[PDB]
Symmetry: D2
Subunit: 380 residues, 4 copies
Amino acid sequence: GTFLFTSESVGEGHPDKICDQISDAVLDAHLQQDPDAKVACETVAKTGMILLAGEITSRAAVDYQKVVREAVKHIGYDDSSKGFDYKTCNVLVALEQQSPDIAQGVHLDRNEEDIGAGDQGLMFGYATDETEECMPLTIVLAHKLNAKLAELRRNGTLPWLRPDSKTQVTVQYMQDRGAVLPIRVHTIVISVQHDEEVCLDEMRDALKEKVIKAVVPAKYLDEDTIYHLQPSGRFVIGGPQGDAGLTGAKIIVDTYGGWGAHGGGAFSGKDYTKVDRSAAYAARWVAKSLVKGGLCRRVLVQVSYAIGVSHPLSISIFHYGTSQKSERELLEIVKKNFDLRPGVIVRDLDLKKPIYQRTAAYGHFGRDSFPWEVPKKLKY
Amino acid sequence: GTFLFTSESVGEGHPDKICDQISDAVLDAHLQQDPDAKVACETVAKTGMILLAGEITSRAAVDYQKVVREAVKHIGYDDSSKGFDYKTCNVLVALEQQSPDIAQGVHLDRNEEDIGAGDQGLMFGYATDETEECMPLTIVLAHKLNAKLAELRRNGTLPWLRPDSKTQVTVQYMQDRGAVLPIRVHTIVISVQHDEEVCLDEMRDALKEKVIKAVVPAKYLDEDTIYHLQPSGRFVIGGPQGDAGLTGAKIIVDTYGGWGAHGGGAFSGKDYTKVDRSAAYAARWVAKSLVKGGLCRRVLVQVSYAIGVSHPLSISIFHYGTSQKSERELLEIVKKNFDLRPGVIVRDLDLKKPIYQRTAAYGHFGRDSFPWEVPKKLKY
Amino acid sequence: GTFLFTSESVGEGHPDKICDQISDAVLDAHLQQDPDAKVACETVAKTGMILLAGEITSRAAVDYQKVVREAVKHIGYDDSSKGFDYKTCNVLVALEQQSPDIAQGVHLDRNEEDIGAGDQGLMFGYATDETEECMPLTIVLAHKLNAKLAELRRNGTLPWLRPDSKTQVTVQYMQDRGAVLPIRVHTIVISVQHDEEVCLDEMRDALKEKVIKAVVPAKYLDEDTIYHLQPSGRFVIGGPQGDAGLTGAKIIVDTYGGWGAHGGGAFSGKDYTKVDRSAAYAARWVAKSLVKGGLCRRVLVQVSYAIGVSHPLSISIFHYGTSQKSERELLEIVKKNFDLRPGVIVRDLDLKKPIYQRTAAYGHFGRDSFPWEVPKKLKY
Amino acid sequence: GTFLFTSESVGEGHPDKICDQISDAVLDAHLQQDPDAKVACETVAKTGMILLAGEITSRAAVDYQKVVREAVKHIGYDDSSKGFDYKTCNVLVALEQQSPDIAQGVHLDRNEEDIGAGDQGLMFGYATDETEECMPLTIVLAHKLNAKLAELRRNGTLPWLRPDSKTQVTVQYMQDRGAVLPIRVHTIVISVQHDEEVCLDEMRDALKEKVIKAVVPAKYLDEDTIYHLQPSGRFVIGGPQGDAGLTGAKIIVDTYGGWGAHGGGAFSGKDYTKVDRSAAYAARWVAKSLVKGGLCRRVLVQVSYAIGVSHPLSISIFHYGTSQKSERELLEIVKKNFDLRPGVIVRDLDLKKPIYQRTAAYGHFGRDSFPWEVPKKLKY
Ligand SMILES: Nc1ncnc2c1ncn2[C@@H]1O[C@H](CO)[C@@H](O)[C@H]1O
Ligand SMILES: Nc1ncnc2c1ncn2[C@@H]1O[C@H](CO)[C@@H](O)[C@H]1O
Ligand SMILES: Nc1ncnc2c1ncn2[C@@H]1O[C@H](CO)[C@@H](O)[C@H]1O
Ligand SMILES: Nc1ncnc2c1ncn2[C@@H]1O[C@H](CO)[C@@H](O)[C@H]1O
Ligand SMILES: [K+]
Ligand SMILES: [K+]
Ligand SMILES: [K+]
Ligand SMILES: [K+]
Ligand SMILES: [Mg+2]
Ligand SMILES: [Mg+2]
Ligand SMILES: [Mg+2]
Ligand SMILES: [Mg+2]
Ligand SMILES: [Mg+2]
Ligand SMILES: [Mg+2]
Ligand SMILES: [Mg+2]
Ligand SMILES: [Mg+2]
């Protein structure tokens, strides 16, 4: 009656995550001066290069060189010895205004509450009572392992560490009436970029004793836990030099780690009129509100939109059998309590605030009491 | 006892799909001369620009200008009036060899069968008996609507059509003992790029009569079906001019349309040593083999890997209650019948063959009897 | 006692000249809002691509997409059939602020009159009484042949013409006491981009009858004049698709066509603190003032600078024996009448005015009564 | 009876010279495998970026990443502390085949001796007996000052030096019957990039004692010589980070330092069919042959071409009055002794040999006994 499930996470210096952070740094910079900026900023990273590509219509005056370079500095890529340096990399910009055809279809001449969805699409929200963060344990652990790497790099404990890292956690679970109950960590993978001087045994020892043991509750570890620590044997070349980065290339890391579902919409570099972002945030908020309200233990919420249309086209609720209420009753509760138009979500979740760079590593969900992580008290 | 579910698809000229097709055109070109080419080719598209970024180690001599431009020609972007032209766009290349640290960790000096996974990661396979293609109806319909658009453009029936299109289908379902049974199409969205001369009513009439009616079985349509046809009102600007494209930005379109799950791994531009591609293909093959073998009606398969390690770290099977066999029994059957090392999958699925461009629109699954769509006869 | 001399010119759509015009369009846009903008804008052109590279510190808010695209529209590249289209090309920007090390060395905290030269360098000015424009006949004719091409393209007389063109004129001269006296046109070359429909004989006939005969005074043409008209035989591919363009790649076309001398400094995309521009303009002004003042018939002026130093390091005057005054006397006259500090030249020549795009085809000298073409009355 | 004249030179790490060296490295790499490669490679450099733009048709298999990066390594940009690093910069490639319209006009189906000029244009050759190298003293000194900088950097004498440098020398001359006779160095400018630790007085002292005194014969220096050493006061930011680089942006540095004349044709990145290179080299060879043959002391040679035509359109010889022979007699001698078709020059000067990178700093003329610097014995 047990099953395995695996999730992964990446660190701040993973090339895809560099792009997500830069795109959201660019978005925040616009929003700081123009709360109504229309932003759709993709970032591409390869050896020595940050390229911004996409569409921005805004009143803000933004110094892209500064914004990009400060983001890469925060990540820690500050010397050619590390494979990338904010001081001396190439920053190229291919940014145009938003298509006027889109603008006229979505928001021009509309009352804010009634703005159309910025695109079509489908979005899911998920919550699970298995952790206090209402998130899968597999992904929560994976994220914390990367955060611990960054901490130890930054505080000088493990000065051989670089910014690019990946982690993966397999948990063995049992189920109870459709809820899931973690039993033990089955397998942990950690790969992290490193300097030329440190040997593999020192790294593997440090990853076990200073990272894994510092993060994973000991009740979940036993003698049969499998560790794959620096399994490649060598990871000196890293960041964009080792592997190309794109914005929106970590959508599963950003969300639920393989649990629930995903509609395909990336978050980073988009203002609230992009329902890929605002409706996914709202959907998480719905799902979390249902669980923390005691109406279910686990729940998946789907919504979907058409470009130019303000109201969702479909809402669906799946409770995995973890409620005494029917799924149709939960749907009636959601419909009574939430207004999932983007022009209303923006007010409920304060989505014109320039806090997006903070979302762009370690997952958008399950941390920091962002507005979509504060449950709505439900009337029913 | 009914529920709604929504999936989307995009056409060949959607800017993300242009990138996926180009990346796979580049991969095929390498594989045509060097079956063992190591390829990790991302493509970025914006107004007038195709950029290739990533890592390729190969013996092939490839003319990137020709390969890229022929792919964009096939898609149909051949004049500045359409917003993009293969004859005159910019093709920029930022391609390096594969990192030697990766190469030494994964494949150098290894027997082919025992090559390590090209990366860590998690991958799901899904199959459902609701259609002959073993795919969700929502996504199958969405894909066929885009294919019909392309057909009508190409044959000159609707010469006002351009290549960039999106579709979305919401089906109303009932469930039966964990299987799903489609009842009716609830909502259809179609947005498609068009010329400056055609009016909106002509387009909406054509989308209803020549596209939707030609594709959706009439038993699924009724008087309450909701149509959102060119809901933006105007879509003259399109392709990379309207919206930036990236490779791997359509991973849900490429797979199961929101059903099942996704581990986050994009397919296009990667050779078989990238388990994001090979293991996802194998997982689909497993799932399809279970359903077509009559062991379940619906099934989700997870596998996961570590870089440099040949065997999967975890396998999990979820049958939604649609089998008399336990999930653990299905897992024992999968373990008996499949070898999910990448160096074995490559032989079973013939993944050195240059057929990848064909996968890169209209979904990787549910069509054309690709090798991963031919069920394995199971011993148990 | 005769000699041949050859000069060339290029048209507005020659890829190097596209870059010069774009760089000066960018400069003008800055100067329109911030008269003290520091601008060093290089432009690179290839198939489908305009890249801006360089350094700009300015208070202006400039829409590079608009500025670039409007410049390419003015040139006439507006359809993929012509090989380039302002509507749909890629505009990439790699622009940073001026180096603070340069800024502190040249202008920060300085009184305007005493700003240092923006760089080291040498610059020449030249004037010759052989034409009313005080320019060599060879280059004046070459420029007018390109201007006539553009006129006939624009007015629809020769609608098969495209924007990319080159011309070259060889004149046979005699000398008189160091002045030069044109006798006849020896050879004319014209190459111009064209459509796919027009045949070579129609083009060659039109180039002779509608272009050459319309431009070159008939006294200079005879039966032995050699014509090389579309000598390549085919010129359908042109503009940046046929040949890469760079700013500052037409410095001889921009100046004296091989006569006099050149110190190596390009003009386009630079504000007045760049002495490559301001001192060359001043030097032309000196040379023209000497000739129109009747102090010589032909004259070459050299000046040179060091970065951060306001006054020139060297001034030299060479009159080819065409004055009764010694060269040292002409030098004393120049020193009495001109102040060749950049912070003074800017006032004399009004070099903060946004008129630079107009300079960037058909030569910077010998036309339009620009301020450096209005002779200073000399005191001596 | 004296006059001043100024020339400049730049060092190997000047951003324009980086581009010239890279373009010629790319050319050499092609020529190493395919002696008939058609190459027209421009290079653009800015912070963190090397872009190759242009046209190459060749049978060679060239690894642009290696070729570019090895060239930047040779120059000395190997750490982010220096502002640029060959290990980690971005190398972008926008290279297409040669235009088929050009190819058919110039060389396809032609006997090699009779290939047409690769373009129209004018080119000058110059030689002067004032130095053993037959070059102006002003430019020879400027080049040697940069070479001494590189030597002292490379051998560790002045380890605070970086690769980017500029120099400028003003010589006071007298004339003798049209020959020029250097008397003294009037002014020297040196600007060189440096580390953050060295103070200005140490630099200025070293530039005087270790560079200028090591290079300039003491007979040319006196107490009135003016020195402008690090005149900006600070030059820590340098290379492509301080200033954009382009190929062909140092054409006066590459040739005669302001003496003689220039037709506008850049050398680097072009195979011999580009007469900008081959005919300029031949013209230098003619001029040097005239002087070393004792037919004049100083001489300027002009030639010019039309695209597709093998023979020059015009030849002109100007001896400044430094011969007893008339200019027309020298012209008859040149015509008797030289064949200035590009398909013949290639044989005389061995221009398919991959030695071009060596030409791309410190001037193309006056050094190393390149074939165009070995005088032809003249028959007359
Ligand atoms: N040598 C290596 N060993 C393990 N992981 C690596 C290595 N190089 C890169 N990676 C990580 O895996 C991803 C894909 O190659 C990169 O973004 C990086 O985070
Ligand atoms: N004006 C429009 N109306 C509807 N869809 C559009 C429009 N412009 C672009 N799109 C589609 O939506 C996506 C996101 O803007 C694009 O890739 C494109 O396919
Ligand atoms: N086929 C051709 N015939 C003549 N001139 C050309 C041709 N193609 C390009 N050119 C011109 O010559 C230059 C160098 O190839 C280009 O900028 C262009 O102006
Ligand atoms: N701070 C400086 N001082 C002097 N010369 C410089 C400085 N920065 C750059 N340069 C040189 O002058 C050129 C133009 O700015 C550059 O290529 C570089 O060689
Ligand atoms: K990648
Ligand atoms: K996008
Ligand atoms: K060129
Ligand atoms: K520059
Ligand atoms: Mg990735
Ligand atoms: Mg989407
Ligand atoms: Mg997209
Ligand atoms: Mg992955
Ligand atoms: Mg040119
Ligand atoms: Mg200069
Ligand atoms: Mg320069
Ligand atoms: Mg030329």
